[PDB]
From a paper:
The principal target of these antibodies is the primary immunodominant region (PID) on the gp41 fusion protein. The PID is an amphipathic 15-amino-acid region that separates the two heptad-repeat domains found in the post-fusion conformation of gp41. Cluster I anti-gp41 antibodies, including patient-derived 3D6, 7B2, and F240, bind to the HIV-1 PID region (HXB2 isolate residues: 596–610). 3D6 has a near-germline configuration, and F240 and 7B2 represent anti-PID antibodies that have undergone affinity maturation.
In our unbound Fab 3D6 structure, CDR-H3 is mostly disordered, suggesting some intrinsic flexibility, however, primary sequence analysis using DEPICTER19 does not identify a region of intrinsic disorder. Of note, this loop was ordered in the previously reported unbound structure of Fab 3D620, allowing for additional comparative analysis. For 3D6, the CDR-H3 undergoes considerable conformational change suggestive of an induced-fit mechanism of binding to the PID. Residues S100A, G100B, S100C, and Y100D from the CDR-H3 loop are disordered in the unbound state. Upon binding to the PID, residues 100B to 100 F extend to form a β-hairpin in the bound structure. The CDR-H3 loop moves 2.5 Å toward the CDR-H2 loop wedging the PID into a pocket generated by the FR2 C’ β-strand. This movement breaks the π-π stacking interaction between the aromatic rings of VL residue W32 and VH residue F100E to accommodate PID residue K601. In the case of the anti-PID antibody response, the Fab 3D6 structures presented here support the notion that these non-neutralizing antibodies can rapidly arise from germline B-cell receptor (BCR) configurations and bind to gp41 spikes using preformed paratopes.
Author numbering:
A (entry chain L): 1 to 186, 189 to 209
B (entry chain H): 1 to 52, 52A, 53 to 82, 82A, 82B, 82C, 83 to 100, 100A, ...
Write the structure that this text describes.
Amino acid sequence: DIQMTQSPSTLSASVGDRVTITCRASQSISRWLAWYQQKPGKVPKLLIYKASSLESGVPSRFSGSGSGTEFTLTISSLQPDDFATYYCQQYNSYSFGPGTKVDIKRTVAAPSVFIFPPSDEQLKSGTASVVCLLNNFYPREAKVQWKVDNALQSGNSQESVTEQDSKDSTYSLSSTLTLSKADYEKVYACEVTHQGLSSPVTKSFNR
Amino acid sequence: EVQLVESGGGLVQPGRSLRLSCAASGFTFNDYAMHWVRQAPGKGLEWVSGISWDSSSIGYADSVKGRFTISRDNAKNSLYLQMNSLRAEDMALYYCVKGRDYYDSGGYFTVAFDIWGQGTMVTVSSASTKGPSVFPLAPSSKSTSGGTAALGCLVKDYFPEPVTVSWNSGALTSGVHTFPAVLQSSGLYSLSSVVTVPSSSLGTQTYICNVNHKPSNTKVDKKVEP
């Protein structure tokens, strides 16, 4: 079969930068290449067909080139809403490349840290969930530890992160500490580290 | 308007079968090759199968050959995928996709793969369908910063995906972060959806989360308060 490859596999870049994404075919496919944009949670959208024809109503900052074996997609001036995974596809036997995930670079922004204890309603059925929320930070890298009556936790917390916000290019993050009602009758603290905080920060509550 | 409406996705035991369907409208269905494409959680797009306008040629990816059967009914403007002997690798979102026009060989006035269906989820598992529990994330001194408070809903212990969440029936979009679901060791999914709003609005506004888990026929509204 025809194998499609892409490089780099991820890249971060500032608003206004020129970005160049490369796609490669294992053998010659002439100009039979398409490029797709996929935003998380949405269906893929055709941007370029026949290597360089812009699909209708796609902004003019997108362009494609190449014929044969090596191909590029160029975003001439990157915008906050261009955050996505970009896939090439050979247009003869329909096979896709593995995608390039584009992230928007912006100024460092420390998270706002909020904490929520279990609801009364939940407690009633013998399980307790403590949720810590890091809101509207950049970059994506962060550290959240759980302490209970000062005792540091392990294995009993899961994290989730949103996609980049399409206006302000920030991330948010939930960490959820799971414990039984039993164990929870025993000061609960979420401790956060991040490039935007001069030193770590701790949100906590009692009981 | 040109559309592809999918159905038939759901939960099925490993080794068992499901039929996907896709109803076309707004274009001359008879004139177009048609395709299926899938995407496994957090992974890339994979072409699955295609079929010519008159069904005289059919193609499959190597990973599905012998287990999947594509077909169409032009009189009903419908495209189907019969999936048998389902396994882990087939767990994915499945897209109905519009191909090349029979008349436009060179695509001088037509472009292939321009119109996609919304997607339909296939889950391959012996585990049970289970509705979520919906718990409030109440705004407090410890979820406030200057002129903003954060509140939300915890949507816990459902299978399979998906679940949807809105706030005040779509009338509140700004400041909403609905987190991607994570799989808990127990084998059930859970997520939170939060929203930040003016702290002074806590007195004037009502904040309700609308949770819908179609696989289990569960709709829940939870009002959340200080």
